[PDB]
Structures are given as C-alpha cells and as structure tokens.
Copies of this chain bind each other. A is one copy, B any other.
Amino acid sequence: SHMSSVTIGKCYIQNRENGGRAFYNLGRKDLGIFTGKMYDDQIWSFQKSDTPGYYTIGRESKFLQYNGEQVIMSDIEQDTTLWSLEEVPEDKGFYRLLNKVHKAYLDYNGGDLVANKHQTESEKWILFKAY
C-alpha cells in the first residue's frame, strides 16, 4: 500500500503503427488515442515507481491503469498502474508497455486504448520528450 513514484520526465506516447498519441482530457473524461494535431492533453508524466523495473504513466494527478477489463485512469497508484518497458528488438527506439498485474500490452482499437496479452504490431510505442 501507499505506493509512490517520482516523475522522470514529460513525454508524448505515440504509436508506431498509426502515429497516434495517447491522450487524457479531464474535462471530457476522455481517454484515447488521436492521430492528428498535437494537443497539451497528449503530454504525460513518466514516473519511476517504487517497484524496481516498473514505471507509472500519469496525467491530471491520475495514473494509467489496466484492471483486466479496460484501460482507465486511476486516482490512486495501485499495483495495476505499474508498467514495464519491453524493448522491441526489430524497431530501435520503440517499446511495448506491459502491465505488471495482468501481463497485457498497451494497444489500441479505433480511438480507444486497450490491452492485449498477445504481441501485435499496434503495441509498439515511442515515448519522446515533450519539452
């Protein structure tokens, strides 16, 4: 309990397969991926968690979470907000983001963020410095 994390940097989280960026808009309660204009709500806090080798992904004082059913934003840092970076051997600079609890990779379907246990081509992300 009482997990903590420390912000490492601010970054965009962009998909290799469609160039789309993960975003979270608090006012619309909207979490998704968008492929056009770059907006401020596509900037995330990348955080070293208190658990070795695992990171959290934050926006608007919340944390990116996979609960076994959907990808959502959590008000509290839970074990299900821990992600590891799995380098993609064939695509230097890209990572899969693997949920610790559920061993599911961050993916997308249409405009939605999802998670998948099988490795696929739309699970490859580049997390680049926003500033």
User: Interface of chain A, helix or strand or loop or mixed?
Assistant: loop
Residues of A within 8 A of B (CB-CB), count: 20
Complex interface: chain B residues within 8 A of A37 (CB):
16-19
Q: Complex Cα distance A130/B128, Å? A: 9
Q: Does A38 contact B (CB under 8 A)?
A: yes
Q: Does A4 contact B (CB under 8 A)?
A: no
Across the A-B interface, give the 3 residue pairs with the lowest CB-CB distance, nearest first: A93-B131, A128-B128, A92-B131
Interface residues of A (CB under 8 A from B): 12, 14-21, 35-38, 92-93, 126, 128-131
Known: A14-B38, A19-B21, A19-B35. 5 other contacts (CB 8 A): A18-B36, A19-B37, A92-B131, A93-B131, A128-B129
